[PDB]
């Protein structure tokens with residue numbers, strides 16, 4: 001159903017490509033153009049084979065060489081495209097946690113939009129790489145109900161998608177109604193359990209039924225009922241339950257919409273989704289924000305950075 005914008009290259013010859021990359025870096029200067037035109041046109045799997053060939057041909061590390069030749073945002077963008085798919089989210093997560101500061105925005109974004117299937121892989125990939133337990137790192141860097149919601153999510157235990165049980169839809173909407181609007185204060189525990197564990201098809205029916213019953217969209221109650229990270233988290237979850245692409249098209253938009261740009265978010269969403277559903281993200285960006293993602297990246301970015309990005313995203317009309 002989903003569609004990314006980067007696919008496997010047809011006449012792939014990892015050895016030929018590595019040679020092109022060597023030339024682009026050998027001697028004085030760099031042919032950034034040759035680099036970017038090549039790398040944004042191979043799938044992540046192919047980029048791993050190229051790095052492999054490069055090492056057996058020249059005994060040099062493709063990524064470490066690039067880190068020496070490139071600079072600024074282009075570098076960061078090229079370094080991210082080189083990260084093996086199975087490892088990127090883990091890498092972004094580890095980096096949001098580590099340090100004297102945590103980027104809850106990153107924690108929220110990845111954990112809420114990734115499916116249980118993806119969360120399990122991410123958890124494995126994370127432990128094998130940093131020799132730490134993701135849950136334990138999140139738990140230690142966060143607190144309150146925000147932390148709880150994240151753990152519930154990390155269990156990747158969401159119920160499966162069965163035929164919808166109306167009595168059950170009714171029950172859950174009423175429960176949410178009683179846990180928030182009809183209450184002085186909030187029963188966050190009830191929101192966490194219903195939002196974090198019920199199936200996706202079930203919750204979509206509950207969101208609607210809840211509108212019917214209360215006159216509010218669950219999003220408005222959340223905003224009325226909560227604050228801080230828990231609010232952002234719950235909104236992210238609700239948004240992703242409705243449509244992950246749509247939720248991501250929106251975090252992309254707010255990354256640029258502001259004055260300058262949140263390049264880390266721009267890089268992270270475009271790269272991480274390039275081979276999953278970036279095409280869908282593009283479509284949702286047009287519908288809801290009037291302009292294609294292309295036109296928007298095009299005006300906020302520049303340099304080879306802008307060229308690579310536009311080449312990865314593509315679609316001038318979306």
Ligand SMILES: [Ca+2]
Pocket residue numbers: 025026027028029030069
């Ligand atoms: Ca050089």
Ligand SMILES: [Ca+2]
Pocket residue numbers: 067068069070071072075
């Ligand atoms: Ca550098």
Ligand SMILES: [Ca+2]
Pocket residue numbers: 179180181182183184185186225
């Ligand atoms: Ca209340």
Ligand SMILES: [Ca+2]
Pocket residue numbers: 222223224226227228231
């Ligand atoms: Ca609020």
Ligand SMILES: [Ca+2]
Pocket residue numbers: 256257258259260261300
């Ligand atoms: Ca801007």
